Design an enzyme around this catalytic site. Structure first.
Site, short mmCIF file in Angstrom:
data_model
loop_
_atom_site.label_atom_id
_atom_site.label_comp_id
_atom_site.label_asym_id
_atom_site.label_seq_id
_atom_site.Cartn_x
_atom_site.Cartn_y
_atom_site.Cartn_z
CG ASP A 1 -6.97 -7.00 1.64
OD1 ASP A 1 -7.77 -6.09 1.36
OD2 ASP A 1 -6.30 -7.62 0.78
CE1 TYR B 1 -5.79 -7.73 -4.97
CE2 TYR B 1 -8.09 -7.10 -4.69
CZ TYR B 1 -6.78 -7.06 -4.26
OH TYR B 1 -6.45 -6.38 -3.11
CG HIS C 1 -7.02 -1.74 4.10
ND1 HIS C 1 -8.14 -2.52 3.93
CD2 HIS C 1 -5.94 -2.40 3.61
CE1 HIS C 1 -7.72 -3.62 3.32
NE2 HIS C 1 -6.40 -3.59 3.11
#
Ligand SMILES: Cn1nnc(-c2cc(-c3ccsc3)cnc2N)n1
Ligand SMILES: Cn1nnc(-c2cc(-c3ccsc3)cnc2N)n1
Lengths: 546, 546
Positions: B334, B465, B523
């Site tokens: 990720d 992010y 995921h």
């Protein structure tokens, strides 16, 4: 007035220069003069090499573009290139042959020691070659000794463009007149000169250093041999392993390669190996410098029995199990030296090799009580004073600064007698209240020990000596065994307690035993003669411990 | 009623038996039947082998005594021994050929999982051979899975003497009728039987396990494939490196060999690699599983800019510098996968090899704003919801247990939609207050994440992010580069955000790219398909990363 020194990498901090191979290749292959050098600088600021140096492309992307330029240069000069020619091979050899210029690094180290801000400013590339680790290692060894490392490929700027010099000045937070700049390329020296920086054109090291000492007013040439690199506690990787519910062990960790577990003595720390840790890691080893049980950041339970050899060794075996290590080389000093021989005797499977500084291998006398054996030797009287719980704790904990300053002294600094300690009523009864600072230690290093011992004190450390009968019973189980794994005994000429002669019969138990001997060395071996310790341990590790 | 299981090492937990080589050697060399076996047991309880097994002597001391016994046995049988015969060679081969009996270990693991106390009871020796590490490794791998390891050479007692059985019972803190004892030697089984212990004579594994499941009432044979070994946080070596004044990085460390740095994603932990850590260490690697900046025991500064890729990568480079590591293999998932490709692009010298799970290599679009690029893909809507400081922190920090239970689910467990997150007003707006526990996790594992996130919360993690524009400007400097170091891209079939197709053009930037693909994997790759992850990473490490 100067307060900053800047050094180039190629031809300055590292020798021979990479450019001083491109010309050598032409001479060896009888190619036209400067043929390869012209292909290197081809296109100038728009060329493949400037893109490489600015970080636009990597070295592996550049190799074929350089090869292309070598053909264009030969076509113009009406000459033909050989059938076995390889740019990759030329650069692999050049990079591999390039080593640190030791007197240049020592000069930078001396300048930084006197308050200077030091920096490496270099035109370098992003190395993605299969052999990149060699350079990565060199850069790692060099960079640690400087305040800043400015690489062209990282900053997107290149020498001689004036923007990198303004970047350098901003990084240093210094005006140009406060900066000395050393470079082997005159063109790269000019913009620094232009801003008012003191500049040195480096051809031979000795002249460059004569120029450097004249301008700084600091002796750099003909200086006494420097001490090895030490450790800054806050810059280390600190490790913690819980070996049993109430017991955690702390260690400092540095390097890659075979695991080397360092075991200090009484009343010490992982910091007692400060001069060995960077050296052993640099020699290709993974160093694990312990805070032994009862010390520093390791747990310190109060019970005497928690400190017998059997328990201490079992815990050291668990430490390995929890780290996922099938083996480690065990190197000990004083009490650590005693543990290390017992690790070898009881757990040979887990001990890759064993080494001891000062502590000989002492086998159990099955026909004599351990306390009687201690009594038979006048120098071991301090061990009898350490027996009664509370007595030595009170004297040692009274004034920590005095404790460490009195104990940590070179052979020609006295200040205590290890005989008639019980009769005199203590270790420091004839010692001054404010002892002078030994040449082996700084005031700051004493204060680290003071701060470490403030946590648990001397109960746990003194308990190591309070298991004589228990250790003797355990040691008797090993009386029919021999140590047949690789082993090193290092003796210290002036250790008046752990005398070299005490080790004379060791070959009877360890037939293949290897030795080292340090002249004019006291009890505190690691800090007394760090250079000699490092030389003996590294030589023995590389030959007997892989 | 049973609550303890005891296993022998030779012929039970490890195969083939060392005794099943001594007889094989006789057959291969056409020596009289039992010639070598008679020399082995020579002298019985007073003989060299009993002294060896009790720990009186070491294996290297025993080798010549065994050789002596081989001559006496041949002199009686009127036969002559060969000119190239070596006892050391026979035992080196026998020990080296002996491997863990996997279904026997799985049975012991299943029994311990159901509440049993498990122990290894063995007649073994103190191994000081130059080749001792092989056995040391085997013992290390086996011992970790049991409550106790009782070695004859350590306890000074040997099977079949009744004292070792009373020692075993005391160690277990159980009455004989509560104990199952498995052994391949009938004579060693008898004293346990004599005390009232359930005993199993082990010839072939399958029958011994049929007998074991009949007596325990627990299925051990034909069971579903077990998950790999996980990590108990309190049993790990915990490391701490200060990378800059206010920034410390925490990591878990296991194994020896080339350094493998594991980099988790959002909102995770070093614990997300729990199933990889023991496997990768067992495959011959030094694992460094990070708590990434903003997570667990690592520092979590509040500033958004502390979380841009350039800073994060620079800090990871310092981490290596401070540990004394010139390189490490970088494996990411990720957000960790994103960092790992940028480490490869900006610091190839420090990256031995690069691997990513799910995260493709995403190059910068120089003709589009990073926020526009996110907007163009509906699945990346959650990243836009993560932009406004405080909004996602409030929803994620509200109920930690609900956060982790909602997020950490397998592909066939929903429970969130990653599209239209901003419109819906949150990640858990259509999620239950008390989500069901996913099959991938236990309640205890959820609680570890809950406890970790109680320290710093979601500000630092969400800030990863919040640097899209900054990361885009930095990434544009690498637009002319290619990744030419060894690289692995692992895709997950059912990851609906990081879809396998997003990685289709990677070969344009990484021409020598290697791949792995996991079917029916969501995921949360590491915990979803741990066995498959381990198989792909180990295969790639052994072939491309040494
Ligand atoms: C004369 N002498 N006999 N035995 C001993 C002895 C010495 C040590 C020791 C030696 C250096 S640090 C601790 C430990 N345990 C012992 N039993 N010393
Ligand atoms: C569609 N898309 N365009 N750019 C991106 C993008 C994605 C990520 C990312 C991907 C997995 S964890 C974080 C980071 N930075 C980006 N810029 N995603």
């Amino acid at each position: 007035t100067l307060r900053a020194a800047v050094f180039d990498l190629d031809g300055v901090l590292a020798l021979p220069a990479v450019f001083g191979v491109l010309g050598r290749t032409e001479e060896a292959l009888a190619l036209p003069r400067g043929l390869l050098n012209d292909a290197f600088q081809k296109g100038g600021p728009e060329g493949a090499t400037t893109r490489l140096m600015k970080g636009e492309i990597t070295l592996s992307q550049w190799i074929p573009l350089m090869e292309e330029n070598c053909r264009k240069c030969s076509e113009t000069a009406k000459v033909c290139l050989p059938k076995n020619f390889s740019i990759k091979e030329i650069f692999d050899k050049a990079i591999s042959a390039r080593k640190i210029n030791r007197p240049m690094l020592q000069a930078a180290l001396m300048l930084r020691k006197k308050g200077f801000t030091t920096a490496i400013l270099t035109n370098t590339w992003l190395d993605d070659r299969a052999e990149r680790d060699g350079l990565a290692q060199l850069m790692c060894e060099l960079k640690m000794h400087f305040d800043f490392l400015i690489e062209s490929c990282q900053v997107g700027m290149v020498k001689p463009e004036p923007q990198i010099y303004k970047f350098l000045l901003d990084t240093l937070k210094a005006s140009p007149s406060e900066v000395v700049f050393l470079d082997d390329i005159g063109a790269n020296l000019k913009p620094a000169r232009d801003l008012g920086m003191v500049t040195i054109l480096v051809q031979d090291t000795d002249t460059a250093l004569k120029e450097l000492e004249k301008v700084t007013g600091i002796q750099l040439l003909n200086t006494p041999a420097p001490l090895p690199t030490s450790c800054n506690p806050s810059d280390m990787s600190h490790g913690y392993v819980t070996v049993k519910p109430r017991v955690r062990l702390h260690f400092v960790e540095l390097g890659s390669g075979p695991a080397v577990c360092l075991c200090h003595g009484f009343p010490e720390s992982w910091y007692s190996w400060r001069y060995q840790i960077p050296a052993l890691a640099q020699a290709g080893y993974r160093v694990l410098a312990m805070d032994m049980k009862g010390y520093g950041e390791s747990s310190a339970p109060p019970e005497i029995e928690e400190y017998c050899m059997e328990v201490l060794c079992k815990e050291m075996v668990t430490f390995l199990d929890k780290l996922g290590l099938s083996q480690a080389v065990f190197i000990g000093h004083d009490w650590g030296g005693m543990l290390v021989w017992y690790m070898a005797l009881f757990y040979p499977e887990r001990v890759r090799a064993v080494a001891s500084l000062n502590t000989p291998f002492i086998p159990a006398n099955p026909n004599m009580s351990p306390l009687e054996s201690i009594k038979a030797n006048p120098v071991f009287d301090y061990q009898l004073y350490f027996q009664e719980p509370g007595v030595a704790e009170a004297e040692l904990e009274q004034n920590l600064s005095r404790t460490f300053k009195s104990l940590f002294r070179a052979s020609d600094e006295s200040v205590l007698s290890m005989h008639k300690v019980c009769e005199a009523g203590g270790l420091f009864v004839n010692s001054p209240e404010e002892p002078s600072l030994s040449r082996m230690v700084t005031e700051e290093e004493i204060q680290f020990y003071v701060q470490q011992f403030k946590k648990s004190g001397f109960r746990g450390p003194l308990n190591w000596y309070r298991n004589m009968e228990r250790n003797w019973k355990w040691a008797c189980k090993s009386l029919g065994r021999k140590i047949l794994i690789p082993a090193l005994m290092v003796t210290a000429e002036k250790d008046f307690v752990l005398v070299p002669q005490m080790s004379q019969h060791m070959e009877d138990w360890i037939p293949h035993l290897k030795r080292g001997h340090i002249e004019d060395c006291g009890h505190w071996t690691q800090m007394d003669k760090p250079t000699e310790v490092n030389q003996i341990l590294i030589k023995w590790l590389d030959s007997d411990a892989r």
